[PDB]
Design a binder for this molecule. Structure first.
Ligand SMILES: CC(C)CCC[C@@H](C)[C@H]1CC[C@H]2[C@@H]3CC=C4C[C@@H](OC(=O)CCC(=O)O)CC[C@]4(C)[C@H]3CC[C@]12C
Ligand SMILES: CC(C)CCC[C@@H](C)[C@H]1CC[C@H]2[C@@H]3CC=C4C[C@@H](O)CC[C@]4(C)[C@H]3CC[C@]12C
Ligand SMILES: CC(C)CCC[C@@H](C)[C@H]1CC[C@H]2[C@@H]3CC=C4C[C@@H](O)CC[C@]4(C)[C@H]3CC[C@]12C
Ligand SMILES: C[C@H]1C[C@H]2[C@@H]3CCC4=CC(=O)C=C[C@]4(C)[C@@]3(Cl)[C@@H](O)C[C@]2(C)[C@@]1(O)C(=O)CO
Ligand SMILES: CCCCCCCCCCCCCCCC(=O)O
Ligand SMILES: CCCCCCCCCCCCCCCC(=O)O
Ligand SMILES: *C(=O)CCCCCCCCCCCCCCC
Lengths: 215, 265, 338, 56
C-alpha cells in the first residue's frame, strides 16, 4: 500500500467496489418471476405488453415504477432438477394453466405437484392463473367435467366446475407458509398486471412480517 | 421505612431487566462476530439499539435511586439530566422502530436509503440531546420529593424540580410519550388498512395469512404502549412499585427472548 | 436379429466384469494399512474475498497461483488477486445465469457459460483498458456445465445435451464431438498432459476420452446417483469423483476399476466439488451440509473439516503449486484456507 | 432405427473390451510411490511456518 503499483492496484480495487455497490443497489429493485406451466397455456402472453427482449427466455415489462422480470424456462429440454436451483431467488412462481384443454390437464397437475413440493421452492408463493375461461364455459356445456376428472360428481355448471378445478389445484399445497394466489383470466379481454402487482406486494409484505418474528 | 421498600424493589426489578438486556447485547456481539452477512442487516441494529437504550435507562435509574438525596445540587442536576436523556432515548427508539415497520409494511418497494442506520441512530441519539439541552437551559432539574398523601418523604429522587409550574415536565415527558404513541398508532393503522385492502384485491379474502399476523402485531404493540402509559401516568407510590418492577422485568425478558428466537435458527 | 445382439452385448459386459474381477487381487486398504496416517489437519481462513452479491457457482485458480476467477448469478465475473484481496477485474456478464468459469493456462483469456447455451471467451490482455467479448461459442443444445482450456486457442466444454465438444476459439466451430453418454455431462477434468480427459454425467458413469482421436477409451460405473464432481490424480493415472450418494470413489485408468470408496454414516449430502492436493495425499470434497471435508486419499479416514460457510459450498480448487484451497459458496463469500 | 445405435454400441463395446489391464497391486503400489515421493513438497500436507506462506 506504499509503492506506486500497489497504490494503483488499490485505486482499481476501490473503483470496482464502487461500481459493484452501484449495480447491487440498481439490480435489487427488480422483481424476479419464474414462469412455469404446461405449453399452449398462453404463457407467452400472460401480460399484453411484455417487450420480450434455445435457453431461458426473458421478458421485462414495467408497471407503476417497478421492473418485473419474467423468465420462461420452457425450451431448456434438460434435467430440470439439475438447474432449477438457479431460480431459488425468485419472489413468486407464475403458473399459467389452459382450462379449455383436457389432455394437458393431468400433465399440468403433475407439474404443479412436482413444483409446489420441491425442496428449493418450499416457501416460494405461487400466482396460479387459469387462462381461457370463456372457451371453458363454452366447452363445459357440450363435454362435462367427468372425462377429465372422473371422481367429480357435483353440479355441471361453469362456476362449480371452475371452483372444483381450482380446489383440485390448490389441494397440492401440503406446506403451510405458502399461499396460492389463484385467479381466472378470461385471456381475451383482461388486463392482469394489477393481479401480479397485488400478489407480489402481499408476498413481499408477508416476507418482511415474517422477518420481524410474526408467525 | 417505605424508602427501604421502594428502593429495594425498584433496584431488584431494574437489575433483572439489566441482566436480560446484557444477555441480548452479548448475544448480538456474538452473532455479529461469528456470522457473516449479519453486518448488513439493519433490523437487528435497531433492536439492539433499543435494547441498549433500555439498558442505559435502567442503569441511570439505579444510579439515581441508590444515591438519592446525597451529593451537591448541581451534581444530581446532571444526574437527572442524564436520566431524562435516557428516558427520551427509549421513547425515540420505540418511535424509530415503528417507522421501520412503516418502511417494511406500508411502502414496500424501493426502500433503500444510503447510511440508513447512521441516520436512524443520529435521530434516536440526538433528538433527546436537543430536548435535554433545552430543558436544562431553563434550570428545571433538581430534587423531586414523593409524599404519598402523607406529606412524608416516601422516596427522595431528583427528577424535575417542583417550582409551582410543571410545564417542562409535562411538555418534555408526557408530551413526548403521547407524540411517539400517536406516531406508532398512526403507522399501525396504516399497516392494518393496507393489509385489509390487499386482502380484497388478491381475491384471498379470509384465508390470507397477513390478516392474522397484523392482528397479532397490533395486539402486542398496543399492549407495549398501554403498559408504558400506565407506568408514566400513574404516580410511583406504595402498592404500585411491584407492578412497575414486574412490567420492567417483562419488558426486558420479552426483548431478550424475541431477539434470541428471531436470530438463532 | 435385435435380441441376439442384446445377448451378445450382455455376454460382452459379463466378460468385462469377470476380467475386472480377475485383475483384482488385493484391496487398496489391504496394501496401505501399514502406512502411518496423517495427524489432525486444521486449516485457517487466511483471506475472505467479499464483493459478490448473489450465489457463487464456479471459481478457478490461475496457473501463476495468484489470481483466481469467480462467477456468480449476479452477472459479475470477478478476477481477484488472492494475495491482497484486490479485485483486478469485474466483467459484466451478458447472461446472469452462469454455472462455470475457466482461466486459461496463459492467464490471457477467461471463459464463462451457463443456461444460455453459449461459452463466451473474454479477452484480458487488450491494448486499451477493456475486456471485450472475443468470440461466443454456440453449438450446443443444452446448458454448459463445465469448460477447460487446453491452450489459449482450444477449449473443451461439456453440456447438458449429453455431448462434450472440443472447440477452436479462433474459428468458432467444433473441431470434434465427444458423444456416447446417456445422461447429460455434468463435469469434466483435464489430464496433466492435456491429452486425455474424463467426464461425469447423470447416468452415473465416468468415461475417459481421447482428445486427438475423439473416441471414448474406457468407462467406469460404481456410483448410484448423479456425478457432480471429477478430478484427475496429479500423475494422470487415476481420478476421484463425487456423487449425490454422499460418497466419493477413486478410479484407476490401468486396473480399470474402482480402487476405494469414501463414505461416512454422518454424511448423506451430495458432493458438490472435489480436488486433490499437490502430492495427491489429500482429497478435498465440498458437500451440501455447508462443510468441506478433507479426506485421507490413501486411508479413507476423515482427516479434517473446514466448516466456515453458512450456505452450500459450490466450488473448490487447490492452488496449482499446492499452497492454498479456495472454497466458494452460495452465501457469496470465497475463503482462502491454508 | 435403433439398430444403427445398436451396431455403434456393440462396436464401441468390443473396441473397449480388448485392452490391456494390470493388477490392482501394482496400481496401489504406484499410488503409494507417488504419494511418498512428493510428500516433502506438499504445503497443505505438512504445514509451513508463517515466514514462507504468502497467505500469512
Ligand atoms: C429536529 C430538531 C430541530 C428539533 C429541536 C427541538 C428543540 C430545539 C425545541 C423544540 C421543542 C422545544 C421545547 C419546548 C418547551 C420546553 C419546556 C421549557 O421548560 C421551562 O422550564 C420553561 C417553561 C416553564 O418553566 O414553565 C424548557 C424548553 C423546552 C424544553 C423546549 C426546548 C427546546 C425544544 C426541544
Ligand atoms: C445530557 C447530555 C447533554 C449529555 C449526555 C451524555 C451521554 C449520557 C449521552 C450523550 C451521547 C450519548 C451516546 C451517543 C452515542 C452512543 C454510541 C451508541 O453505540 C451507544 C449509545 C451511546 C454511547 C450514547 C450513550 C449516551 C450518551 C453518551
Ligand atoms: C456530545 C454532542 C456531540 C451531542 C451528542 C451527539 C452524539 C450523541 C450523536 C451525534 C452523532 C451520532 C452518531 C452518528 C454516527 C454513528 C455511527 C453509527 O454506526 C452508530 C451510531 C453513531 C455512533 C451515532 C451515535 C450518536 C451520535 C454520536
Ligand atoms: C419503566 C421505568 C419508567 C419509570 C418512570 C418514569 C416516569 C416517572 C415520572 C414520575 O412522575 C414518577 C416516577 C415515574 C413514573 C418513573 Cl421515573 C418511576 O415510577 C420508575 C419507572 C416506572 C421505571 O424506571 C421502572 O423501571 C420501574 O422501577
Ligand atoms: C456502562 C458500560 C457501557 C454499557 C453499554 C451497554 C450497551 C449500550 C448500547 C447498545 C448498542 C448500541 C447500538 C448498537 C449499534 C450497532 O450494533 O452498530
Ligand atoms: C418522533 C419519534 C420518531 C421519529 C422518527 C421519524 C423520522 C425518522 C427519520 C429517519 C430517516 C431515515 C432515512 C431517510 C431517507 C430519506 O427519506 O431521505
Ligand atoms: C419489524 O421491523 C418489527 C416491528 C415490531 C413491532 C413494531 C412496533 C410499532 C409501533 C411501536 C410503538 C408502540 C407504542 C410506543 C410507546 C412509546
Amino acid at each position: 500500500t506504499l509503492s506506486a503499483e500497489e497504490r494503483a492496484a488499490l485505486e482499481r480495487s476501490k473503483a470496482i467496489e464502487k461500481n459493484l455497490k452501484e449495480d447491487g443497489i440498481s439490480a435489487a429493485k427488480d422483481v424476479k418471476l419464474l414462469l412455469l406451466g404446461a405449453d399452449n397455456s398462453g404463457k407467452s402472453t400472460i401480460v399484453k405488453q411484455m417487450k420480450i427482449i434455445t435457453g431461458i427466455v426473458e421478458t421485462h415489462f414495467t408497471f407503476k415504477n417497478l421492473h418485473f422480470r419474467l423468465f420462461d424456462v420452457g425450451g431448456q429440454r434438460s434435467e430440470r432438477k439439475k438447474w432449477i436451483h438457479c431460480f431459488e431467488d425468485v419472489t413468486a412462481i407464475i403458473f399459467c394453466v389452459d382450462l379449455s384443454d383436457y389432455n394437458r390437464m393431468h400433465e399440468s397437475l403433475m407439474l404443479f405437484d412436482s413444483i409446489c413440493n420441491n425442496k428449493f421452492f418450499i416457501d416460494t408463493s405461487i400466482i396460479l392463473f387459469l387462462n381461457k375461461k370463456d372457451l371453458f364455459g363454452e366447452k363445459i356445456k357440450k363435454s362435462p367435467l367427468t372425462i377429465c376428472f372422473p371422481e367429480y360428481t357435483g353440479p355441471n355448471t361453469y362456476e362449480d366446475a371452475a371452483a372444483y378445478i381450482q380446489a383440485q389445484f390448490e389441494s397440492k399445497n401440503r406446506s403451510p407458509n405458502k399461499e396460492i394466489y389463484c385467479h381466472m383470466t378470461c385471456a381475451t379481454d383482461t388486463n392482469n398486471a394489477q393481479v401480479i402487482f397485488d400478489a407480489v406486494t402481499d408476498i413481499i409484505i408477508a416476507n418482511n412480517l415474517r422477518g420481524c418474528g410474526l408467525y | 421505612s417505605t424508602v427501604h421498600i421502594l428502593t429495594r424493589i425498584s433496584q431488584a426489578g431494574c437489575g433483572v431487566s439489566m441482566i436480560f438486556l446484557a444477555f441480548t447485547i452479548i448475544l448480538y456481539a456474538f452473532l455479529r462476530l461469528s456470522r457473516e452477512r449479519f453486518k448488513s442487516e439493519d433490523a437487528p441494529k435497531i433492536h439492539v439499539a433499543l435494547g441498549g437504550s433500555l439498558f442505559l435507562l435502567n442503569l441511570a435509574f439505579l444510579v439515581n435511586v441508590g444515591s438519592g438525596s446525597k451529593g451537591s445540587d448541581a451534581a444530581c442536576w446532571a444526574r437527572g439530566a442524564v436520566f431524562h436523556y435516557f428516558l427520551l432515548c427509549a421513547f425515540t427508539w420505540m418511535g424509530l422502530e415503528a417507522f421501520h415497520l412503516y418502511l417494511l409494511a406500508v411502502r414496500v418497494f424501493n426502500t433503500y436509503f444510503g447510511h440508513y442506520f447512521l441516520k436512524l441512530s443520529l435521530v434516536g441519539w440526538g433528538l433527546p440531546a436537543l430536548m435535554v439541552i433545552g430543558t436544562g437551559s431553563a434550570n428545571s432539574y433538581g430534587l423531586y420529593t414523593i409524599r404519598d398523601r402523607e406529606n412524608r418523604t416516601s422516596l427522595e429522587l431528583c427528577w424535575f424540580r417542583e417550582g409551582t409550574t410543571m410545564y417542562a415536565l409535562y411538555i418534555t415527558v408526557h408530551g413526548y410519550f403521547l407524540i411517539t404513541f400517536l406516531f406508532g398508532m398512526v403507522v399501525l393503522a396504516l399497516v392494518v388498512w393496507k393489509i385489509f385492502t390487499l386482502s380484497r384485491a388478491t381475491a384471498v379474502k379470509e384465508r390470507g395469512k397477513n390478516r392474522k399476523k397484523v392482528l397479532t402485531l397490533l395486539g402486542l404493540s398496543s399492549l407495549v404502549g398501554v403498559t408504558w402509559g400506565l407506568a408514566i401516568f400513574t404516580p410511583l407510590g406504595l402498592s404500585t412499585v411491584y407492578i412497575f418492577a414486574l412490567f420492567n422485568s417483562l419488558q426486558g425478558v420479552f426483548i431478550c427472548c424475541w431477539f434470541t428466537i428471531l436470530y438463532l435458527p | 436379429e435385435l435380441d441376439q445382439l442384446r445377448q451378445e452385448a450382455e455376454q460382452l459386459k459379463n466378460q468385462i466384469r469377470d476380467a475386472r474381477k480377475a485383475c483384482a487381487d488385493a484391496t487398496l486398504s489391504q496394501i496401505t494399512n501399514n502406512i502411518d496416517p496423517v495427524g489432525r489437519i486444521q486449516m485457517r481462513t487466511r483471506r475472505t474475498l467479499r464483493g459478490h452479491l448473489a450465489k457463487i457457482y464456479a471459481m478457478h485458480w490461475g496457473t501463476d497461483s495468484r489470481l483466481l476467477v469467480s462467477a456468480s448469478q449476479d452477472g459479475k465475473l470477478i478476477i481477484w488477486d488472492s494475495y491482497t484481496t484486490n479485485k483486478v477485474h469485474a466483467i459484466p456478464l451478458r447472461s446472469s445465469w452462469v454455472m462455470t468459469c475457466a482461466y486459461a493456462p496463459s492467464g490471457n483469456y477467461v471463459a464463462c457459460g451457463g443456461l444460455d447455451n453459449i461459452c463466451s471467451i473474454y479477452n484480458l490482455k487488450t491494448r486499451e483498458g477493456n475486456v471485450r467479448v472475443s468470440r461466443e461459442l454456440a453449438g450446443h443444445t443444452g446448458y454448459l456445465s463445465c469448460c477447460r482450456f487446453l491452450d489459449d486457442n482450444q477449449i473443451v466444454t461439456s453440456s447438458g445435451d449429453t455431448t462434450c465438444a472440443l472447440w477452436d476459439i479462433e474459428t468458432g466451430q467444433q473441431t470434434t464431438t465427444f458423444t456416447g453418454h446417456t445422461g447429460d455431462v455434468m463435469s469434466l477434468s483435464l489430464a496433466p498432459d492435456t491429452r486425455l480427459f474424463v467426464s461425469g454425467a447423470c447416468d452415473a458413469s465416468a468415461k475417459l476420452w481421447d482428445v486427438r482421436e475423439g473416441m471414448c477409451r474406457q468407462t467406469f460405473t460404481g456410483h448410484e446417483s448423479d456425478i457432480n464432481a471429477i478430478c484427475f490424480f496429479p500423475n494422470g493415472n487415476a481420478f476421484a469423483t463425487g456423487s449425490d450418494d454422499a460418497t466419493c470413489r477413486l478410479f484407476d485408468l490401468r486396473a480399470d476399476q474402482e480402487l476405494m470408496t469414501y463414505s461416512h454414516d454422518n454424511i448423506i449430502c451430495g458432493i458438490t466439488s472435489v480436488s486433490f492436493s499437490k502430492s495427491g495425499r489429500l482429497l478435498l470434497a465440498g458437500y451440501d451440509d455447508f462443510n468441506c471435508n478433507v479426506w485421507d486419499a490413501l486411508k479413507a479416514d476423515r482427516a479434517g473439516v473446514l466448516a466456515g460457510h453458512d450456505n452450500r459450498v459450490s466450488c473448490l480448487g487447490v492452488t496449482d503449486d499446492g499452497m492454498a484451497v479456495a472454497t466458494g459458496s452460495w452465501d457469496s463469500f470465497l475463503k482462502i484456507w491454508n | 432405427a435403433s439398430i444403427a445405435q445398436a451396431r455403434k454400441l456393440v462396436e464401441q463395446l468390443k473396441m473397449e473390451a480388448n485392452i490391456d489391464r494390470i493388477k490392482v497391486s501394482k496400481a496401489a503400489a504406484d499410488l503409494m510411490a507417488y504419494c511418498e515421493a512428493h510428500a516433502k513438497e506438499d504445503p497443505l500436507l505438512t504445514p509451513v511456518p508463517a515466514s514462507e506462506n504468502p497467505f500469512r
